[PDB]
Enzyme design. Structure first.
Site, PDB file in Angstrom:
ATOM      1  N   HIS A   7       0.852  -1.176   0.000  1.00  0.00           N
ATOM      2  CA  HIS A   7       0.000   0.000   0.000  1.00  0.00           C
ATOM      3  C   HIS A   7       0.893   1.233   0.000  1.00  0.00           C
ATOM      4  O   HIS A   7       1.970   1.226   0.599  1.00  0.00           O
ATOM      5  CB  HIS A   7      -0.873  -0.008   1.249  1.00  0.00           C
ATOM      6  CG  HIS A   7      -2.058   0.893   1.164  1.00  0.00           C
ATOM      7  ND1 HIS A   7      -2.011   2.221   1.529  1.00  0.00           N
ATOM      8  CD2 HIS A   7      -3.308   0.675   0.692  1.00  0.00           C
ATOM      9  CE1 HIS A   7      -3.192   2.775   1.314  1.00  0.00           C
ATOM     10  NE2 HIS A   7      -4.002   1.853   0.823  1.00  0.00           N
ATOM     11  N   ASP A  12      -8.336  -4.780  -0.085  1.00  0.00           N
ATOM     12  CA  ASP A  12      -8.702  -5.344  -1.390  1.00  0.00           C
ATOM     13  C   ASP A  12      -8.353  -6.836  -1.500  1.00  0.00           C
ATOM     14  O   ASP A  12      -8.874  -7.533  -2.368  1.00  0.00           O
ATOM     15  CB  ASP A  12      -7.976  -4.606  -2.520  1.00  0.00           C
ATOM     16  CG  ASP A  12      -8.314  -3.120  -2.583  1.00  0.00           C
ATOM     17  OD1 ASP A  12      -9.345  -2.685  -2.015  1.00  0.00           O
ATOM     18  OD2 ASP A  12      -7.577  -2.389  -3.275  1.00  0.00           O
TER      19      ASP A  12
END
Ligand SMILES: [Mg+2]
Ligand SMILES: [Mg+2]
Lengths: 407, 407
Positions: free
Chosen positions: A287, A344
């Site tokens: 991320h 996700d």
């Protein structure tokens, strides 16, 4: 004219006009009080409250109120808000016709068009547009803006569900005032009151994705709003950006990949392959901000576990994802680079099992994030400034027009 | 992480995360070869050609080709382009229904929704979306992208005109293949072939407003396109931004002001009053970039003169505007502060006299600027980077969730 020192982790392009920060990566556009992330510790706050507390104790209705208004509602405020939102769920007949006309199109086009359509006949929106057209944005206008913001949050699931029904040649299922935001969405999609576990999952998803950073969708909303354009148009623009494959689609691709993989036994080799140049990247791992396990992922993983405990894991998605997660968490490459699962990695699993088509994953993200979008716009409007970026001209000057016949 | 020197003429706000350039004023986003403005000398170029030369010797068809492709077309290229554009003018039936449903709404909402709707069923667009979804943007895809860009430029007037017709309870007037872009627009608006002078005015207006560096609408298109979202969606977002009162409305307000003024005799007192704080201020006088007479204004003024010489000046708009202009140009104050008329000072006059309602002024700007928008998107896509700005959180952390009943 003055020079400013801007820190960026992005790539810089050379130009005769000076360095260009590609994609304006890390460039600040405002200060905000909406949400904060501590990437090192892996903490997310909405209006000062940790996401863990909200996921545990709240609902999308309450969290949306918090994000929009900046504080937790009193009992009376929440009741009144819930009742207003319920009334707002229904779309204008013209909007429903727009959706119907786009029934055979990708849902994101229908969302863009439907949001614009709904904004076109919204009387509060028309009133606010009149006010801003003469530069008036005082108490009364702010009240209109908040009502419009509420409408946008309320209506998004209706637009999504209607498109789903029309796209499948099914009769539209209208919102039920006796159902909550998440439950009603599932009801509108499938025509039956949902299982409470499924409803909880949607509610949790909506809470978890309500706001996060300033992605291109949120940025598009700012740019449009910066001209004092209306809230519906700003959200339509946000949706336009959101539909791009560089914004979203990760949770869908993660699920498709788990299906392709088929066996948890492959987890180790898949994770190893991802450490090599040109290797297939693991969806939902790493991320830009989190250098720790994404707090939203930890929470949604647990929901996912509950979901498969009740309904089974027939496509072995949870098993595969779990096996990959464990290898990611134990592989030195990922550990040293602070690359962890993000939300996700997990979020498409329940959707897939709930029967939500892949093409509706991103629309559901819009259902969540719409509250962040509108809250961001309203915040920017407290100190609005139209965006006026520049480009460096590197074309020629004074070329001489040549008659057509001589070219 | 590195530090970059960013020059700006805007306001800087300090924050815990670093400097905030408010509105990203003057912040570079790319190098471009599309258009350039020399504000001190009052010169505008498109792809290296001065606007005066293009206004004198070209047409919107040729200028749009130039803006899109980066060079002047050969005879064959122009003929083929004109024919493709003619074929593209007609809208998909679903798009026409979307416009019909929004007939009673403001045209800019109809434009936003209609552009999204048209993109929804455009086969080329679908194919390009498929390619970009897997990160493929090579020769074949660029060919699709240019085809789509042409369609957007070709279709905008149809969308506008159909909405106009429907808004007036009239049947649409479909595009005439034998008419030019500007002439056909007037034919579709009013159902009769236009007078040559009226068509010239539209063509000239379209040329003059085709591109103008990177305002908020063009920026919105970049932000949306940066996610690899489709061209139609990027244009819909540009329209969303364009709709805001800080992006347009000046040419309409100038005309309404001239109507209120009523008598050219007031020019001297009005201009004198504008030299005091405050004020009021003269519409279409002064510019953030032009510190000289806007070249587009000089050209359009002359067209306007021709128009009223032929059709008359029944509301005295040209007489009033001319009187004011003369006073502005002879008053030392304005000269010394580089305050000159800009195109908005003049451009609403002809439209008003042509019977184009005020609410269609900005839609016509979109008909012009759509070529700049699509050219800018395609240019960005030559080295795409998703926009990744950020906001700096200022506020509390770790607030304690209080049960509903205790708030
Ligand atoms: Mg548990
Ligand atoms: Mg002349």
């Amino acid at each position: 004219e003055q020079t400013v020192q801007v820190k960026t982790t992005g790539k810089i392009l050379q130009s005769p006009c000076g360095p260009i920060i590609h994609g304006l990566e890390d460039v600040l556009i405002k200060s905000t009080s909406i949400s904060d992330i501590d990437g090192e510790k892996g903490i997310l706050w909405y209006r000062g409250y940790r996401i863990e507390e909200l996921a545990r104790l709240s609902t999308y209705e309450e969290v949306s109120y918090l994000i929009l208004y900046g504080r937790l509602p009193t009992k009376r405020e929440l009741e009144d808000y819930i009742n207003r939102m319920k009334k707002y769920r229904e779309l204008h007949p013209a909007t429903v016709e727009v959706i119907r006309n786009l029934a055979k199109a990708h849902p994101m086009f229908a969302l863009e068009a439907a949001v614009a359509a709904e904004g076109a006949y919204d009387e509060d929106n028309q009133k606010l547009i009149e006010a801003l057209s003469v530069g008036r944005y005082k108490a009364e206008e702010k009240e209109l803006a908040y009502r419009i913001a509420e409408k946008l949050v309320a209506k998004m699931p209706t637009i999504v569900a209607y498109h789903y029904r029309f796209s499948r040649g099914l009769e539209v299922v209208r919102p039920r005032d006796d159902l909550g935001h998440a439950a009603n969405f599932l009801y509108m999609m499938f025509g039956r009151e949902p299982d409470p576990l499924a409803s909880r999952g949607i509610d949790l998803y909506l809470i978890l994705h309500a706001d996060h950073e300033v992605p291109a969708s949120t940025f598009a909303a700012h740019v449009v709003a910066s001209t004092l354009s209306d809230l519906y148009s700003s959200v339509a623009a946000a949706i336009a950006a959101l539909k791009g494959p560089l914004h979203g689609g990760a949770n869908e691709m993660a699920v498709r990949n788990y299906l392709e993989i088929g066996t948890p036994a492959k987890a180790k080799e898949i994770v190893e392959a991802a450490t090599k140049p040109g290797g297939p990247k693991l969806m939902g791992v790493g991320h830009r901000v989190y250098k720790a396990y994404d707090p939203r992922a930890k929470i949604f993983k647990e929901f996912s576990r509950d979901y498969v405990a009740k309904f089974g894991d027939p496509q072995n998605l949870f098993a595969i994802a779990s096996a990959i997660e464990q290898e990611v968490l134990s592989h030195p490459y990922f550990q040293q680079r602070k690359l962890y699962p993000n939300v996700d990695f997990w979020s498409g699993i329940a959707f897939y099992y709930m029967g939500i088509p892949y093409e509706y994953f991103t629309p559901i993200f819009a259902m969540s994030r719409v509250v962040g979008w509108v809250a961001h716009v309203l915040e920017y409007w407290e100190n609005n400034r139209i965006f006026r970026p520049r480009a460096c001209y590197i074309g020629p000057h004074d070329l001489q027009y040549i008659p057509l016949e001589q070219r």
